[PDB]
Amino acid sequence: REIVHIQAGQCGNQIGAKFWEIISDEHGIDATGAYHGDSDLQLERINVYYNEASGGKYVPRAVLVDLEPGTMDSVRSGPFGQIFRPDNFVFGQSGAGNNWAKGHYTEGAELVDSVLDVVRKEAESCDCLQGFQLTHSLGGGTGSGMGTLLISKIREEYPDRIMNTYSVVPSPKVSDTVVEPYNATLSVHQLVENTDETYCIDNEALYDICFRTLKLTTPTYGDLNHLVSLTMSGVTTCLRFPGQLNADLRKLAVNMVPFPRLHFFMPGFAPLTSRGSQQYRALTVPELTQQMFDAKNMMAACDPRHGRYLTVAAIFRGRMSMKEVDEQMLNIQNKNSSYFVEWIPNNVKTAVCDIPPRGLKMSATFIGNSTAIQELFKRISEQFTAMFRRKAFLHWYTGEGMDEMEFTEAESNMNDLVSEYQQYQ
Amino acid sequence: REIVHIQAGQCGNQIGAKFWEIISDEHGIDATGAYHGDSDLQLERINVYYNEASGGKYVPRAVLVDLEPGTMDSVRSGPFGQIFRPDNFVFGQSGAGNNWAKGHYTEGAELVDSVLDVVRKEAESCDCLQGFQLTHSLGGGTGSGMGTLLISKIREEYPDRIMNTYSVVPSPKVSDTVVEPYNATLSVHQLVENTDETYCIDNEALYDICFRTLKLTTPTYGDLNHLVSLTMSGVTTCLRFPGQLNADLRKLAVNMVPFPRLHFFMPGFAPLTSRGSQQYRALTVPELTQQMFDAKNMMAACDPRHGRYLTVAAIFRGRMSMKEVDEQMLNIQNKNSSYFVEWIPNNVKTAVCDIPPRGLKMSATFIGNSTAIQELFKRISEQFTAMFRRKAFLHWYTGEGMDEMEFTEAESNMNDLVSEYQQYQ
Amino acid sequence: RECISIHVGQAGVQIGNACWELYCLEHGIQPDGQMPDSFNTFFSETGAGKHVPRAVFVDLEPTVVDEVRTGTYRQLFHPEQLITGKEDAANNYARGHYTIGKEIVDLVLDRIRKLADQCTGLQGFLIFHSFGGGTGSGFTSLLMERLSVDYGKKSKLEFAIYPAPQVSTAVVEPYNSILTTHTTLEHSDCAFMVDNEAIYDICRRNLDIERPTYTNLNRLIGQIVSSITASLRFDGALNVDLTEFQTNLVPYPRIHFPLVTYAPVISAEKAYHEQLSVAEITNACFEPANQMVKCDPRHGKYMACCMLYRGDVVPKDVNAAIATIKTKRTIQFVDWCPTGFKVGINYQPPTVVPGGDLAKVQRAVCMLSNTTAIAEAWARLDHKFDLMYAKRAFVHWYVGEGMEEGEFSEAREDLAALEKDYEEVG
Amino acid sequence: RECISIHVGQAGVQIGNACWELYCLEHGIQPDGQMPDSFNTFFSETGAGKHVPRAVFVDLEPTVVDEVRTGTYRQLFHPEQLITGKEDAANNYARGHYTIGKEIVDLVLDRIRKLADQCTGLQGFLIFHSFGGGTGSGFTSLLMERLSVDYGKKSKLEFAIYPAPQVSTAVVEPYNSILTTHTTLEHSDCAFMVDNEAIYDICRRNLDIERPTYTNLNRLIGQIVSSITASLRFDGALNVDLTEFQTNLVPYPRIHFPLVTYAPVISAEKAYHEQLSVAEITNACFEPANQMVKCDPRHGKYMACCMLYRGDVVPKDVNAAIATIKTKRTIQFVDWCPTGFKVGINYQPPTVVPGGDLAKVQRAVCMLSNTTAIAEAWARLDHKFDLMYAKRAFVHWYVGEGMEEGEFSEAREDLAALEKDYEEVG
Ligand SMILES: Nc1nc2c(ncn2[C@@H]2O[C@H](COP(=O)(O)OP(=O)(O)OP(=O)(O)O)[C@@H](O)[C@H]2O)c(=O)[nH]1
Ligand SMILES: Nc1nc2c(ncn2[C@@H]2O[C@H](COP(=O)(O)OP(=O)(O)OP(=O)(O)O)[C@@H](O)[C@H]2O)c(=O)[nH]1
Ligand SMILES: Nc1nc2c(ncn2[C@@H]2O[C@H](COP(=O)(O)OP(=O)(O)O)[C@@H](O)[C@H]2O)c(=O)[nH]1
Ligand SMILES: Nc1nc2c(ncn2[C@@H]2O[C@H](COP(=O)(O)OP(=O)(O)O)[C@@H](O)[C@H]2O)c(=O)[nH]1
Numbered sequence A, B: 001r002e003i004v005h006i007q008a009g010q011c012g013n014q015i016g017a018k019f020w021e022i023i024s025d026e027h028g029i030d031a032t033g034a035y036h037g038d039s040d041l042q043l044e045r046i047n048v049y050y051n052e053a054s055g056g057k058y059v060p061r062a063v064l065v066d067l068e069p070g071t072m073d074s075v076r077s078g079p080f081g082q083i084f085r086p087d088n089f090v091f092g093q094s095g096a097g098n099n100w101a102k103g104h105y106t107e108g109a110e111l112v113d114s115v116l117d118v119v120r121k122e123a124e125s126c127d128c129l130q131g132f133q134l135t136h137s138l139g140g141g142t143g144s145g146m147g148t149l150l151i152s153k154i155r156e157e158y159p160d161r162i163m164n165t166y167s168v169v170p171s172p173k174v175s176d177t178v179v180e181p182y183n184a185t186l187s188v189h190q191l192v193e194n195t196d197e198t199y200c201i202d203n204e205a206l207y208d209i210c211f212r213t214l215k216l217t218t219p220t221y222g223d224l225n226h227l228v229s230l231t232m233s234g235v236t237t238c239l240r241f242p243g244q245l246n247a248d249l250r251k252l253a254v255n256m257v258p259f260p261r262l263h264f265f266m267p268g269f270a271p272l273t274s275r276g277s278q279q280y281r282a283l284t285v286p287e288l289t290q291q292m293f294d295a296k297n298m299m300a301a302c303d304p305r306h307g308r309y310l311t312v313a314a315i316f317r318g319r320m321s322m323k324e325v326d327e328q329m330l331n332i333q334n335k336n337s338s339y340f341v342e343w344i345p346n347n348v349k350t351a352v353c354d355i356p357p358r359g360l361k362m363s364a365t366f367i368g369n370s371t372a373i374q375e376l377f378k379r380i381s382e383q384f385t386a387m388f389r390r391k392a393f394l395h396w397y398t399g400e401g402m403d404e405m406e407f408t409e410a411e412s413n414m415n416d417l418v419s420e421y422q423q424y425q
Numbered sequence C, D: 001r002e003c004i005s006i007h008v009g010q011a012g013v014q015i016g017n018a019c020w021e022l023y024c025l026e027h028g029i030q031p032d033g034q035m036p037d038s039f040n041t042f043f044s045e046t047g048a049g050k051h052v053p054r055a056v057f058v059d060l061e062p063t064v065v066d067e068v069r070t071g072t073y074r075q076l077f078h079p080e081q082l083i084t085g086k087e088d089a090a091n092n093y094a095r096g097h098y099t100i101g102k103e104i105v106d107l108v109l110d111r112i113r114k115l116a117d118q119c120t121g122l123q124g125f126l127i128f129h130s131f132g133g134g135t136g137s138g139f140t141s142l143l144m145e146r147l148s149v150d151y152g153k154k155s156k157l158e159f160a161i162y163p164a165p166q167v168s169t170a171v172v173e174p175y176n177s178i179l180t181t182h183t184t185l186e187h188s189d190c191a192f193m194v195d196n197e198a199i200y201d202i203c204r205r206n207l208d209i210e211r212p213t214y215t216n217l218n219r220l221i222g223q224i225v226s227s228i229t230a231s232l233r234f235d236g237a238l239n240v241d242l243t244e245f246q247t248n249l250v251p252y253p254r255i256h257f258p259l260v261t262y263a264p265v266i267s268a269e270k271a272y273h274e275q276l277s278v279a280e281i282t283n284a285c286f287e288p289a290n291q292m293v294k295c296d297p298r299h300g301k302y303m304a305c306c307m308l309y310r311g312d313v314v315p316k317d318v319n320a321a322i323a324t325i326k327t328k329r330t331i332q333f334v335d336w337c338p339t340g341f342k343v344g345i346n347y348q349p350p351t352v353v354p355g356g357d358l359a360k361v362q363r364a365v366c367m368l369s370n371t372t373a374i375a376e377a378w379a380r381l382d383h384k385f386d387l388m389y390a391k392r393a394f395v396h397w398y399v400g401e402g403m404e405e406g407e408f409s410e411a412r413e414d415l416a417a418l419e420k421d422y423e424e425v426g
């Protein structure tokens, strides 16, 4: 059970750069592939992201993508940049210029062969794998254009496995590009069918968490990428360390995705405390659980209180007590009986791992599938209906041959998706 | 069986700061949350005011509010300033300008959600609490404005549990603000119904106690708040230390309030002696008891000789003998049969604790419900009757939407209250 | 918590200049602009070691602003903040409001919006001007009409100079000092009044110096301004705010003309013989020989007043000192004012300026009383203006500039009503 | 990534002269071509310690190109890159396109192919010229007709100077500034418009220089061109490319006339007092008193603008500063454009040139807005040309050169249609 890594676009790299910086510290690997750890538990399941090389060195199972050469120099020269194998850096030379049309048709058609040759190499090397995970942003041109293409090609080759995407969906309050709505609409037409587990993140809410809860005065992209990577590292703890109760990727998908189309999640992490207020807290499970479900700490631009949770999952880390976890699960459910779907008794999935995060006693991750995602989509599409109606900017995309059926199909199926969430709320 | 703490206005904090300076001394808590005591009886009932945190530290269960930021820095920077949790420091940014109208309607409506979120947090942490205790002044704008609004909103949440307020009601001889009568009359219309128990203190009298009985030449607000803190500290010593006879907050309410509207009390403390005249006294109960009911040491602006006591309570601390305490309460009732209501025999209630005040052998506290409070209200009302007639200063409050019916009922309901005390006198 | 000051006319650069020497010494900010906190209510920071005031200098003549441009204090003010005209008003309220004002009123109003951008909790503006000249009468009244619309509820404080009845230097002074009465009445939240001749008697008798010139008289006014805002800038036993102040003082919307006085003002050698205690410097405030505008409170009844003590004072005796005066039937208060004393005690001692005419004190007092004696300062000057207008003298100068013949009718009808209100409450 | 700049006429050579001194100082490259990397976008290497630009100087007069041959910067330019003529255009568009256009157009077009051969990922060309004279109107329009055919898809940028409505220096200006409008409209992917008067006002008010001559006005233009292409040469938090830029800005094929403005421009002494932060500079770019062409955006509705910051900036506040202006109803945007901003953040501070009129700064902002206010700059002009052609003055000069009488019909019919498009989108 090991899983290969794909990461695309300019945005995907800084999200991808911090992941390999954090996870090397978790597993004891130095910046040059050496090992200096203490627990033998690090080496028990090391091959999940790493593969063995000569001389007692490990290099990651990373397949790195780009379409412009500028971002390559930064990642190569940065901290923990020499870990990657040089062949893995696959990048073009021209650029996308914030287009979905160029990212799928014109420039993605040529560079796609190079990456699929590498990902085919990573698949045969591993003995028995389960999934691929991809990190990208849903507002740009390369990440949306190339990311949607690879997902299509990968799915047809391996229909029997699980697939992961950790997307960033844009928000109007933090809007940055005049053509954002065209990018976000054209992509989601395919993630509705060609991925099994999808996580949505807003750059707007990341600013709320760093301002209010964490008391950060200068949120740079150094800090925002820190928050997301801790969520990715948390989902795959059961794959790498033992525990009283275990839950891997296939265990979550079956238990918490109720219907095939309803796979859009909301992250959430706890504890998140400031460096000055950390001396004024306890160390106990109750304080962790009450923080997960907080509408003020969830990691997207949605208030769950506008709807009712379908299913959730809470993943805990540290030496813990098994009553103190499940007993408090019912305290939330009965005391808050209004916010949970009535015809799904005991909506909560549970898991406990043993090895805690370094420097801490306890932590936890919340993955709650809610019906409040139905508001994220009309909020974006309303942006799009105000522009496409008057055919603004449309000539730039039409030069590559798309037809207005493509937009209507994009609009119709997104209405089809929005419809599916309302009745089952 | 625990209590949470609420402090309002500039007056409340300077009162509130001294309370935590002395009560940390009883329980051995250092200025940094540590413990260095001797008696195990300190830790038996510690959790009534503190909640434990990680690393063997305690922080108080105080919810400290403000409406201007100027008074916030001093309490943070003073002695025992780091004791409080930073999140509990709640304050506005504009100010009240000695207005009840702004303190209730315009500015309090926005900070009400912030604090009520915190007091809800402190209510869930405790296992089984009984009351909230509030310190504020009845003359200012924020203290009367917000203190009324919190009491109204807090009550409807918990109609079953006990509530305490320790207000400071103004006096004419030390009058300090041109619009004082407007503040006091509009505030009292609530405490007649929305609070369970009320302690009245006259800022005029605390000077009389410091000149005459204790011989002070320079009473600063450091010393006056010292007198009041020893009263609030003393009422709840039964909750924190054992004794032959016990009396908690709920016990006093049933035994002292004869009728639901007659809950305006009158404090007193003994001994209070100068540092040069204290080697010339005995150490025995009789000297403590006479000083109790003495009309010269009572801590408000009334003479009890103008009426008859309904009921009292006397709380003794130290190793004492139970006959001596009761043999004397009959002596005063028999010797002074004129000053007590006739149709309630044996009006005096008793309690004895074991742990003495630090550095002393004995002390006592007097809480006596009298019919002489009826003069504190017409005296203040007489200030107001000469004001609203000619509509002076009225337009400043009327800008926020108050109506003359609000003043008329403010006059009528005070006449409703005054009539009740004279008939049962 | 922000405050912005506006100086207009020559009288503004007169007074405004002395203040900003005083403010810099208070906060340890050298004329170069660096501090070798709490100063942010008046100053602005730029990067490192640079403070500049939050002020705008306005003038309609080039002469009296070129003095600050070259003097010792050239390095504080931003060059755009120092605004001059080309032709002064020539003692015309007619030219001030109508003809020459409209060609500069836009220029500064662009900067007030620029200066009001950095404010976060702005309370209001301080206006330094006089009723003597034409620039500070017409043009200044033009700002308050523009400022009031743009902000509404924000408080505006103006520090006026009223013309003396005998010791006066112009010929048509009543014409200006009547037509300003409209705009101050309906567009000023609190209006301070001071006369020029009364500053002399305080300087003659109490200060014991021979020849008071305009350098010294401004320094007395500078101290009053610093005292009121020392509550915004520092911390003490009991506090009073600018908005908290007007609630205690102004009883009706039409009555916002307080009188000011200060204590103690004393010479260097007479400072050694007296012991300066709280008890009597609160009695010096009600000396009618020390009141800063020539009125007799003996013919009026106090209906409010305010005390601001700064230094090392304690609340125990202040109540006693206030209680002492309340027993005097000489000092009269209205029947509906059972208490009329709002006190604010501040901990930071007042700072003495080199080259001044005051000696160091540990404590000082500022008194602001809203009395009905001031009725005589308008109804008795209204006779002067009425004496002029019988024969219609000088009117040809103002008529040709745009204002009509009846504009003076409102000027007296407004003032007749305002004196009438002080009768009804009295 | 490669780019080549072409300079036409006296105006092109003057503007070009200022730029290539600016580019050298940015990369620390001596006038001799040695550097005591990333410069390859503009410069070419020759073995070791030799750097020569990708420039071509084009002219029909020897005198104004004989200056660069002898000046301090003679040793940078490869000698044959720099082309002169023998007879001028005599301020004729008629001689520019036809009679003298075809006698040199082939010579330079041969050199472009040599310069377009070292390029590997060519983006496009940079064209500097002016609409006033005959050389830069007829010959420049001849190159875009030749260049567009030969290359097709890759974009071309040109930086025009429009003739002023009031302060103009020639007599027959309207004739050429109407006939150029055809080839700019169908053969320029993004056309930058700059006026000569507005450069002066920025010099008078903001920059506080008594006498701006042509040395300074060109130095202002040089800073803009450096700022747009700093995205290619350096790296930062968020990157914007030239192809990335066109998509976000140009909304329809017929509307590619952005208006440029820059901030901060400030004098040496005025720099010490003001604090230059992100939140305040981005407001200055939207001032109608700082726009680089005399148009009032108050009568136009925006539909695009681009913000290009460089220096010490963080994206946390740039979000808030943009949102701040979104709340103002004074600045209006089209309804069908709910978001209308493109943001590019760069890490390298701008470099100040010695002998210039700018102070050293940590941050600088360049704004490119595609507003519809510009419709007046052409409709106002077309009245002048229409006034001329009623009586057919000066036409005898142009008729004899070959162009016919209806050539002005297309000259106005092209312009008539273009003003409708700014209406229909408006
Ligand atoms: N405190 C103080 N008052 C002054 C000074 N100079 C003039 N005054 C007062 O100003 C009055 C003269 O009218 P101004 O206010 O100066 O008129 P102006 O400011 O010159 O305005 P214009 O009428 O436009 O010229 C005199 O009655 C003086 O009382 C000064 O330097 N200090
Ligand atoms: N920035 C700048 N603009 C100039 C300069 N010289 C002339 N101009 C502008 O150019 C316009 C005149 O047309 P030119 O560009 O000079 O025409 P030309 O370059 O001389 O070409 P010919 O018509 O062949 O002589 C004037 O309106 C000026 O605004 C200069 O040296 N610098
Ligand atoms: N969370 C996060 N988002 C980023 C980061 N860098 C860029 N983005 C977001 O990515 C979005 C657009 O991605 P884009 O630059 O177009 O990716 P590209 O098309 O591959 O170049 C922007 O709206 C940014 O908010 C980062 O470091 N962290
Ligand atoms: N007992 C006591 N009273 C105080 C103290 N400080 C202020 N006060 C009283 O508070 C009253 C004014 O109320 P204030 O604090 O201004 O109300 P606020 O507007 O909420 O701040 C005055 O009449 C004082 O008598 C203190 O330290 N002790």
Ligand SMILES: [Mg+2]
Pocket (backbone or CB within 6 Å): C009, C010, C061, C088, C133, C135
């Ligand atoms: Mg003057």
Ligand SMILES: [Mg+2]
Pocket (backbone or CB within 6 Å): D009, D010, D061, D088, D133, D135
């Ligand atoms: Mg020429």
